[model samples]
Target: ASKTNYGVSLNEYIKLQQRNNPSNYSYSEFEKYINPAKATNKLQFLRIDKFRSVNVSGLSSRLSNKGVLTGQGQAFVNAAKAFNIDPIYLVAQCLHETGNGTSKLAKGVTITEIADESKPIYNGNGQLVGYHMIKLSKPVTVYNLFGIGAKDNSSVFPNRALILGTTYAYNRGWTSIENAIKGAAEFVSLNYVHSSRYSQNTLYKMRYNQNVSNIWHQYATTPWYASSIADIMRSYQDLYLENNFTFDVPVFAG
Candidate 1:
């Protein structure tokens, strides 16, 4: 007697076979022959540990100055060192949020003397990050790469969008890409890295959100972020987490 893919035990399978199907045979005889597919070898789910850097050297970008680690990659390493958080983790958020430092908000939005001051079409840039000084109103310019500390409620009645993270950064003095990167790393550390304050590590928050999004919280308004960041970490680990590598885990106020 053999177990069936339908989850029938071997004993049950035999009982059904001998009686021309059991009293209530839910599964068909064909299912007995079709063994269930083996489970794939997957990395541990909901796994979070101390912050570790997964090198993003392979992540190509024009900011690299001909593939050299100058603008984009340097910001990651430098900011990670300053903040004492996982550089790789920061990179994961950057790639997802700012589209590899290529978003208009990441580089900084430009403004000028327009007919209407408040409605200037703020554009995103990469290098040469600069903006004009002016009074603020609705839809202010944004330069935050990580989209940290965004403000106000969002409206999407008919495909309307207002990204206020840049406003938050601007208020916090995150005017340049380097500062934005560094500030965001520090922000995540302060709000989310306190393992004592939170039961879930950064990984769990990345994958799952509670009633209120904590750890400075949610990349997308959904739960796909954990797997996405995990996959990115896996790629970096496979490619670059070399031997004799270790990093410090920063403690935050709980």
Candidate 2:
């Protein structure tokens, strides 16, 4: 008996997810790409703890030139070491989440908006029925680079990213950019990397979590999340020629 992450074939699992979540990607679109056996060249999947000796000055200079990550290279390195994560992968994840550190949340921003709180309405049997919208005026300044707790409902409101991200930051006491940076690293280490169930330290694991029971605990809902980080990491690897890094390739058995 062949066991799978969700007690089903990968195709079946994806099909079930598509039915529930209703994503734009067809199952065939992204499914084939994830299987390493189909690739033309040997796919390189980075171990999250391998790239520690990454060039800090190069990373700092490149990001600082982009108007963010100023003198924060050592901060990233330290956080990676403290959390047992790859510095290069951390930098790449930051680049993708912060739009190369040019996003308002990356630089820290102030926002004044009507905060929407959902008060869930349950039935007599304690079953969830609906939610009541509780609106309040909230003015906040926050620094959140990794988009932790930043819920998106852009169709319902404008600037939801800034509003929600800042609100989360303000509430969590991430007042400084450096604090937020290190905090984001800590958050990942605790919830994802070091977690007993979801040790998703690698970009591959973070995106395509291989939990045996279900396809849950993914870092991002985006299908291309892992690939996006890989692009940035690959660029750095090319520039610096990092030789100590190891790759984890996932091959499906036919």
Candidate 3:
């Protein structure tokens, strides 16, 4: 799908998600999006191999065949090589976030104007109590495609807000899509792929859980954030099992 058309669909999907019932934090809630063909009774869908091997060449091939790797494919391959992250996982994760780089948030470029104002608040007596400052800005973008530095990540998400900026992507010094992808890959390697900040640097240490919601709730506060991404990854998993892809990266099925 074209970028604009994909974004229109994404925004609408998000709106519908907002109306859903609160998460019970149950397995059913997760499978409801990540996997349904196995039936809700099956928990095997939740299992992921922590030590599972990554097939970068295969992933790149598939992505290319799918026509998503025409321009940005190199960045993904290089980033995965440098960071030792699964190319498939990285691409799938980005796909889950960007809707194939179509979401307005993922494609955001810059903010040109912002409206700042103060409105009066009234007490029960109908008397003006104070003023509330409101901040609103013209949409441009959130440079971080993989949503790096976008979460509060404070003390297990007790309470935090989203961080929006060029910190995670292209910026004053961080130039090019490759740089952004590398930066994002490094971020994931450290935080999400670790048991602790000082944890070992290995795929086994990643925060990837069968039940991603276990780690996701603390990563991003936005409700359905995990579910939304899970839907994409789960769908891709089904396809990857039956498809073939080509890549420029040296074959690494290990």
Candidate 4:
């Protein structure tokens, strides 16, 4: 039987991700993209491994409990869906940033001084509020996902750097979520040029071979990465249907 296409077919997506790696880039440039600190060499990437399940549940729960447009999280999910970006990526990055909505910024009550000046706030009328209010923006970029202020502009130095830098880039309006995903996919493909830690500092040829081998093994073992993500959307669809919300089928699934 053809595999169900709901959640990620981890095996298939891994193979696709592996096959997409770039050939012309240097190790340093590749490192800038995947950034070993954020890259995962084990069974799965860190964000994929940790919150793949949470993404499925959390998205469902938020839609069911909070109503579609009420919560910040739901709004972000809606944005991700609109942009064709993976909700999992956005949620994982948010978890990394605001500590899973437990941080002072997300709670909507506690107020703290934001150390960064670039993050400006907008009023209800869309006027710039200059960052004194409790709510800063629809998507906060404080975590520096795009490496806005990394010491050496090398926020792409590690996997965390990539994650933060990318997230920062998205939230800061530096790029759309769709572009961010494409960039990330490209980064993943050029694994050889990334830091030594990503491929164990092996030479370029060795790293490429190792990456290919590892991705193949991963795809062979578990092909659910893509379909599982689709399933996450399915769960959300089920919730929306149950709640009497207008079912935008293509938007939710595709």
Candidate 5:
């Protein structure tokens, strides 16, 4: 027989137990359980639906003053409205990923298509060679405000950022600043925000992904992901102090 938590069956936990340490016979032991309400803190989860006066003009003014993603609030609002996502969360994500839009990917990068022409000077044994490059197409600049498809290890960080960042934007056809910003939101909407399967619409859900049994569908790997975005959202909320805003507060018990 299995138990339940918060109306969700604990079959997954038994499954988890079997997959890990089932033979240890320690599975039957119980740890000290506490009242979930007392163990939890009141966390405010911002609702994703349309709210009062979170308009483009106000967002534009705020972003402009922030000196990051200036003059692109309209695109943010359009993307959010189109996907039924929160404009504030979208903007906060952009700000966080692009270092307040000051990072190179946010600023855009110009890349000229290189011709497939290179001179290779091989060694006597054909073991090593030197290389030379030539030819180019017209230069085109691409933007990637969300840093999609841009992964970097410590070996080649800043350099890889531009290479992969520009390539990702170019491949996605986000040649314009507005297109990149809106495209990022659309990506988030389909995969995370408005997903029929993994609908992580709220900042809390995006980070914690409580709807799923496992932690695979979460938006960010960082432990502080939700709190960081919440801090940004709080900043904007304090700046505007809009009314009638709703929050989805999740409380769990053991």
Candidate 6:
């Protein structure tokens, strides 16, 4: 069997998948379905093979500027540090969720106007305008849409509230540092085990195999990639180390 390596590019990774299942699929077909364009920013310099020894901190820094991650991304980082969740796992999940923060949903709806209907808030065009459009007896802020305890119910409004509410929902009310970690783990488990797009599809398998191979290759090519982010949890552990955080789960040392 071929050993896994992590140094391959997205393009190279796709090629490997095609090679593995030539008759059943083609790289172009897979690319159309996977939508590589959505991952362009995220995969710009994703050297999986060298991941083991790469300067994860430096890579994080680079990712921050690459538009692949956002302020919300930093929120996940902090949440990981405080709650003992793996930073890499959280980051990867966000990448999956937001399409590297490029998703239309991730960008979210803007709340230019608000009105209370017998049901929920709706616009002049009779469309649900903002994030959580639940109807209430009185005017409400966006923060309290899910009732996750913003400072004041009325303080949150319009776009800010929508963004916060959506993020909270995605985290499943995981506000505290500890809850964030636990929630994140649960999220990963649920999605990986149950989601067809993640667990049951050829795309996911190919991506996983490609990622492993890329990391192995990075181990061979660069000194830094050899030192950081090799195994499953090591990436997260290293991020915590760099950020001066610790977690309940043991780091994946491999």
Which candidate gets the maximum lDDT versus the true structure? 2
Of candidate 3, the 10-residue stretch with the lowest lDDT total is 245-254
The predicted structure with the larger lDDT, 1 or 4, is 1
- The RMSD of every model to the true structure, in order and in angstroms, is 14.8, 5.8, 13.6, 16.1, 8.1, 13.3
Instruction: List clash counts for every candidate, in order.
Output: 2, 0, 5, 46, 0, 32
TM-score of each: 0.52, 0.75, 0.45, 0.26, 0.69, 0.32
User: Scored by CA lDDT, what does every candidate get?
Assistant: 0.46, 0.64, 0.42, 0.32, 0.60, 0.37
Worst 10 residues of 6 by lDDT: 244-253
Candidate rank order under TM-score = 2, 5, 1, 3, 6, 4
lDDT of 5 by residue, 1-254 (tens): 11112233334432333344323423233111112222122222666544234767777877865444887778877777776677777878888887888888788788874211134444576632333433336778888887887655233233444555666788788888778878888888888767878756666667655554644666765445666776776666643435656666443332
How many angstroms is residue 253 displaced in model 5 relative to the true structure, after the best TM-score fit?
3.5
TM-score for candidate 3: 0.45
Q: Candidate 1 at 93: error in angstroms?
A: 1.7
Cα lDDT tens digits, model 2, 1-254, are 11223344566555654554435777775575455445442212666743467677776765665446766777787777778777777777887788877888888776554234455455686754434533436645568888776665434344555555666777777777767877888887788767766766566667666653445566776666677777777666643435665566553333
Indicate the residue-level lDDT of 48 in model 6: 20
Quality of model 6 by C-alpha lDDT:
0.37
Which of 5 and 6 is ahead in TM-score? 5
lDDT of 4 by residue, 1-254 (tens): 11112133333333444445532334444333222233322212211211122343455456433311124444454544443333444443343333444532233321122323356455576754343323344543332222332222222233333333434444444333334333332333233223344331111111222333344322111223323323344434332212211111100012
- Per-residue CA lDDT of model 1 for 176-247, tens digit only, reads 667777887776666665445653344434333231323233334332345456565554455335343432
Per-residue lDDT tens digits of candidate 3, residues 136-209? 34443334566554433334332122223333333322344556566666766665554353332222213122
Off by over 4 Å in 4: 1-70, 86-89, 96-98, 102-254
Query: Which candidate model has the greater lDDT, 2 or 3?
Result: 2
Q: Please give the TM-score that candidate 6 achieves against the real structure.
A: 0.32
Better of 1 and 6 by TM-score: 1
